[PDB]
Amino acid sequence: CEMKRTTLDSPLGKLELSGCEQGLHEIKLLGEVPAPAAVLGGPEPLMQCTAWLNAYFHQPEAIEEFPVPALHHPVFQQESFTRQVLWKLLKVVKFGEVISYQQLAALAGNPKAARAVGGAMRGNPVPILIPCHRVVCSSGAVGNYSGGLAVKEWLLAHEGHRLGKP
Numbered sequence: 001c002e003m004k005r006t007t008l009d010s011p012l013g014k015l016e017l018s019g020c021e022q023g024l025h026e027i028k029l030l031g032e033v034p035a036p037a038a039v040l041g042g043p044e045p046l047m048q049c050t051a052w053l054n055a056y057f058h059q060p061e062a063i064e065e066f067p068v069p070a071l072h073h074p075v076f077q078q079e080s081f082t083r084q085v086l087w088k089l090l091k092v093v094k095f096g097e098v099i100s101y102q103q104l105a106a107l108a109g110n111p112k113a114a115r116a117v118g119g120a121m122r123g124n125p126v127p128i129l130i131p132c133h134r135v136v137c138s139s140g141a142v143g144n145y146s147g148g149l150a151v152k153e154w155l156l157a158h159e160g161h162r163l164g165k166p
């Protein structure tokens with residue numbers, strides 16, 4: 001599992017994608033014009049990811065046409081409420097949609113685990129790809145975000161919600 005990295009510039013700042021032949025491991029935000037990945041080439045999960053992010057930001061209308069790379073981060077290798085949460089979020093909530101913590105909890109098999117769900121969100125190694133930014137309060141409020149409220153709001157405004165891009 002030899003780690004490979006590449007960085008990509010985005011409207012959110014520099015993104016560091018890391019992965020192996022078996023799958024994308026992480027997307028990390030290091031902090032108007034589409035940019036290329038600093039290092040071109042494989043492994044495949046990294047090319048898929050970079051292609052996916054470029055579309056998400058600059059070609060959103062076509063986001064569904066891009067394959068979601070295979071994930072190989074430790075959290076996905078073994079079972080856990082955290083994995084079940086991340087996967088459920090990944091496969092269910094799409095571009096423009098939001099979900100409350102309670103709905104995600106129930107979706108993961110336990111309606112009373114909204115808190116554990118909120119916790120599982122901080123353990124997401126691949127933000128944006130796995131839309132933890134779409135998990136919001138049932139009150140209508142945006143809610144907490146591991147990467148800062150401002151980023152969460154940007155992503156949401158980016159997907160159509162009536163919030164100004166901070």
Ligand SMILES: [Zn+2]
Nearest residue numbers: 001020022072
């Ligand atoms: Zn790996």
